């Protein structure tokens, strides 16, 4: 219901509604968690603030969504974790330029995943070796 009605809500409504959503990280039932990540990816690709200044809300839900999206890279379920890994590794959410990807990698730190960060970081840096004439 949220995913369907969500490209109509006002930013304040979406802040009001996001808190019970992101509460699903600990949830079992990977299907529920997958729906969560779907709506979080939607509100990440829509609240990047392409313009200059958003209200206190629109800038804040992007923060709260990006944090859980980062936290999904260590989700204890493959495929799902693969889904978030592919989403982050996709172009326009993490730059294709290798140097720019390097700087953008730090943007997705979020200490809660520190133990895995370095691994993931090299992952993101070395998955773009498999786009090259040199094989």
Structure tokens at 49: 């603030």
State the greatest distance between any 2 C-alpha atoms of the chain, in Å, as a whole number. 50
Main-chain phi, psi angles of 58, to 5 degrees: -60, -35
119-124: long-range contacts at Cβ-Cβ below 8 A with a sequence spacing of 24 or more? 120/73, 120/85, 123/85, 124/88, 124/89, 124/94
Determined by which method? cryo-EM
Crossing angle between the packed helical segments 58-71 and 80-89, to the nearest 10 degrees = 130
- Residues 15, 16, 19, 20, Cα dihedral to 10°: -140
SS3 readout for the chain: CHHHHHHHCCHHHHHHHHHHHHCCCCCCCHHHHHHHHHHHHHHHCCCCCCCCCCCCCHHHHHHHHHHHHHHHHHCCCCCHHHHHHHHHHCCCCCCCCHHHHHHHHHCCCCHHHHHHHHHHHHHHHHCCCCCCCCC
Q: Which of 112, 102, 91, 92 has the alpha carbon at shortest distance from 48?
A: 92
Given resolution (angstroms): 2.9
The Cα 67–Cα 87 span in angstroms is 14
Judge whether 8 and 46 are in contact, CB under 8 Å: no
């Amino acid at each position: 219901i949220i995913y369907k009605m969500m490209p109509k809500l006002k930013p304040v409504e979406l802040r009001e509604l996001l808190n019970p959503v992101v509460e699903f990280v600990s949830h079992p039932s990977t299907t529920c968690r997958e729906q969560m990540y779907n709506i979080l990816m939607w509100i990440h690709d829509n609240y990047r603030d392409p313009e200059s200044e958003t209200d206190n809300d629109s800038q804040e839900i992007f923060k709260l969504a990006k944090d859980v999206l980062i936290q999904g890279l260590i989700d204890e379920n493959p495929g799902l974790q693969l889904i978030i890994r592919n989403f982050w590794s996709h172009e326009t959410r993490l730059p294709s330029n290798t140097l720019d990807r390097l700087l953008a990698l730090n943007s997705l730190y979020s200490p809660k995943i520190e133990v895995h960060f370095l691994s993931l970081a090299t992952n993101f840096l070395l998955e773009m070796t498999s786009m090259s004439p040199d094989y």
